[PDB]
DNA sequence: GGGGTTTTGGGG
DNA sequence: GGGTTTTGCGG
DNA sequence: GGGGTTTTGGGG
């Protein structure tokens, strides 16, 4: 196998030709008809990766790769632009002045993937190790070989890859419109944005919330399944979106079976300059506190910083298998997310009682002072997308004798039949726990078959 | 201002309890739709979204007769006219009908419709199906949630707060998590189903069925 | 044998 | 090829 | 022609 450059592919053989490249763009592989699939992508090399630079705005330019296949299973998945894909049997054509390679994998062609940063998406969401620097973490047909000469190339084309994304933005502005400007694309267009937040809709969907450099914020629908890889706080190219204009309660974006959703690899400048440019954004959950029915979810809390490395775990697994799974039951501290249904006791004034701590035991503050140290005894009955249709309520308790969820309410204990602002703050509280698309991000300790709050503190 | 047609009926119907009087009467007018698909699933669209039409007996009954060269599963990308319609909640398992969501859906039940053959109509975005969409999953979501509120207060009582020694002081104390788990209703099965809407119920025929009676 | 492809009958 | 399937909540 | 396969020389 020889491998031509990009750029020096010919035009007129019209043989077979073999190459590496870096994908920058690429569609998800969508099915066309009763027998054929697709995926069409970017990609660029160093012969091929820039528009001739003085008048061209330092836009990108590249070379098009069209996959054909009669299963789905035989395109490749790119999550990640920057990583490198090496394509045998693919013939070139110059289509509307680009130069287009077109390889048909069910036939004799075939392409084969390589992770540019240490791991290839999949194995950063499972905290694997890659095999080698030469193993493909991806491939068509059941076998790919790589031969020794290869080294050089993919280890070449890598170091490439990071001064590539490190020095220009690869995806330019051309390449993408700003949200604040979606409502005037006639059709689908191309998103850059950051992704503040990713609320659990339902058993398979992820809704995304969007803010692009325009300071634009958006929401759109991510299945779980097909785009696994989102995460909070990272920026990601989406390809093909449109602008929902059915929708007037929240700005949305609608995508297709051939959208996808993509990351930057490590080194990229694009993303490294969003993630700081970009900040968090609570304008929309601000302005839903004010209506009796807000269509917009609106994460209620904030955990300590040093749990945001945390993965989270459902109610399902927490009430339904933290005793029967392996795991679940190494673990004695959690994270997780869920919606309060109901608040007990239910008199607000009764969330604060007195504590004796050689009893163990608590009352009422409704007979003075004579009771011991003011505590939170709160029972919070919650629900989530896991156990969503299921007939039962969970119990997540906020008991603070011990200091464990002490500033939840940003209200120190008080007694509240006395101290009319601590019950106020705790009585609105209550209100915005138990309305409808409020939700808490928290972490809770096991304790004797219980979960108590803590290292959670609301931010409204 | 909402544009889709489908949309706004299908929300104000589930956010006014199933209760089809109740909704806008100014909504209650002919529907112009284009045909999507009419086999395996007959699919109409607003412009916007794409549901799934009911027809009861009398109504293909009445289709066939008034327009008797016409096939109904034949109806794909042509433009149909429902003059007399209305709207209903059913339950439903979610997890066989696609046109559902939460295990919930409402139905367009279609009593009389007539095929404008031959219409072309103004080029539009591609059909979704709206039990799909952001703000009408929300929406539905809402509406269960309202149902799930009311029950839970209603059959949650008494403050049965966990007694704090079993919490503080627990270093020789052993629990199971599932001691936490609470029934939110009086439900019978394992699955929430307290609702208060009234499920409609009117009889409809299958797809297939009308198939058959076209080309058995 | 059968695909895709063009070899349009025949390699290993 | 900057596109539209069912597997109809990867396609 | 050449794969994977078995058809092990020949179809469409
Ligand atoms: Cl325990
Ligand atoms: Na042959
Ligand atoms: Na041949
Ligand atoms: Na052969
Ligand atoms: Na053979």
């Known amino acids: 196998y020889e491998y031509v450059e990009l750029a020096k592919a010919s035009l007129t053989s019209a043989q077979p030709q073999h190459f590496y490249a870096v994908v920058i763009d690429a569609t998800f592989p969508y099915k066309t008809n009763q027998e054929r699939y697709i995926c069409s992508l970017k990609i660029v090399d160093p012969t091929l990766y820039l528009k001739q630079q003085k008048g061209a705005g330092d836009a990108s330019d590249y070379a098009t790769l069209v996959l054909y296949a009669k299963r789905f299973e035989d395109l490749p998945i790119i999550h990640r632009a920057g990583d490198i894909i090496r394509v045998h049997r693919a013939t070139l054509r110059l289509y509307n002045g680009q130069r287009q390679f077109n390889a048909n994998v069910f036939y004799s062609s075939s392409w084969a993937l390589f992770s540019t940063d240490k791991r290839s998406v999949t194995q950063e969401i499972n905290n694997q190790d890659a095999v080698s620097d030469t193993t493909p973490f991806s491939f068509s047909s059941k076998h790919a070989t790589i031969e020794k000469n290869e080294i050089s190339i993919l280890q070449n084309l890598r170091k490439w890859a990071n001064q590539y994304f490190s020095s220009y933005s690869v995806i330019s502005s051309d390449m993408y419109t700003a949200l604040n400007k979606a409502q ?5 267009f191309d998103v850059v944005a950051k992704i503040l937040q990713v609320h659990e809709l339902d058993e398979y969907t992820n809704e995304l919330k969007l803010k692009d450099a325009s300071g634009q914020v958006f929401y759109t629908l991510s299945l779980k399944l097909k785009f696994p890889h989102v995460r909070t706080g990272e920026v990601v190219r989406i390809r093909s979106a449109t602008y929902d204009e059915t929708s007037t309660q929240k700005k949305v974006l609608i995508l297709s079976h051939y959208s996808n959703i993509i990351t930057f690899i490590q080194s990229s400048k694009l993303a490294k300059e969003l993630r700081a440019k970009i900040q968090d954004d ?25 749990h ?6 459902s109610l399902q697994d927490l009430f339904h298998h933290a005793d029967s799974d392996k795991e679940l039951q190494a673990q004695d501290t959690f994270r997780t997310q869920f919606y309060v249904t109901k608040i007990e006791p239910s008199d607000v004034k009764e969330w604060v009682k007195g504590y004796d701590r050689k009893t163990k035991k608590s009352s009422s503050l409704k007979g003075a002072s004579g009771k011991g140290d003011n505590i939170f005894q709160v029972q919070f009955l919650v629900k989530d997308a896991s156990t969503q249709l299921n007939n039962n309520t969970y119990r997540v308790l906020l008991y603070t004798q011990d200091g464990l969820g002490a500033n939840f309410f940003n209200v120190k204990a008080d007694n509240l039949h006395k101290n009319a602002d601590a019950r106020k703050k705790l009585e609105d509280s209550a209100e915005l726990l138990t309305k409808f698309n409020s939700y808490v991000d928290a972490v809770v300790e096991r304790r004797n078959g219980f979960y108590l709050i803590k290292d959670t503190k609301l931010i409204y | 201002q909402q544009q889709s047609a489908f949309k706004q009926l299908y929300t104000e119907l589930f956010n006014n309890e199933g209760d089809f009087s109740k909704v806008s009467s100014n909504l209650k007018k002919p529907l112009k739709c284009y045909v999507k698909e009419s086999y395996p699933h007959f699919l109409v669209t607003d412009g916007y979204f794409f549901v799934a039409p009911y027809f009861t007996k009398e109504a293909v009954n009445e289709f066939h007769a008034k327009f008797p060269n016409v096939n109904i599963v034949d109806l794909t990308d042509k433009v149909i006219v429902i003059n007399n319609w209305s709207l209903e909640l059913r339950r439903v398992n979610s997890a066989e009908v696609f046109t559902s969501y939460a295990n919930l859906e409402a139905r367009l039940i279609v009593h009389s419709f007539k095929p404008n053959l031959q219409e072309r109509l103004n080029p539009t975005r591609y059909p979704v199906n709206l039990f799909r969409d952001d703000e009408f999953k929300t929406t539905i979501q809402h509406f269960r949630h ?24 627990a270093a020789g104390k052993k629990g199971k998590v599932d001691a936490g788990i609470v029934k939110a209703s009086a439900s019978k099965g394992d699955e929430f189903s307290d609702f208060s809407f009234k499920e409609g119920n ?4 299958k797809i297939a069925d009308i198939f058959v009676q076209e080309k058995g």
């Not at chain 2, 009117?202 to 025929?205: H, M, N, Y």
């Open chain 1, 308 to 313: 945001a490395a945390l993965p989270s775990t």
């Open chain 2, 202 to 205: 009117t009889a409809t025929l």
């Open chain 1, 184 to 188: 005037a694309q006639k059709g689908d």
């Open chain 1, 282 to 306: 609570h304008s929309v959950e601000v302005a839903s506190l004010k209506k009796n029915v807000s269509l917009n979810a609106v994460v209620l809390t904030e955990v300590d910083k040093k």
């Open chain 2, 146 to 169: 309202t149902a799930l509120q009311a029950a839970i207060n209603k059959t949650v009582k008494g403050d049965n707060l966990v007694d704090i020694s079993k919490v503080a002081d």
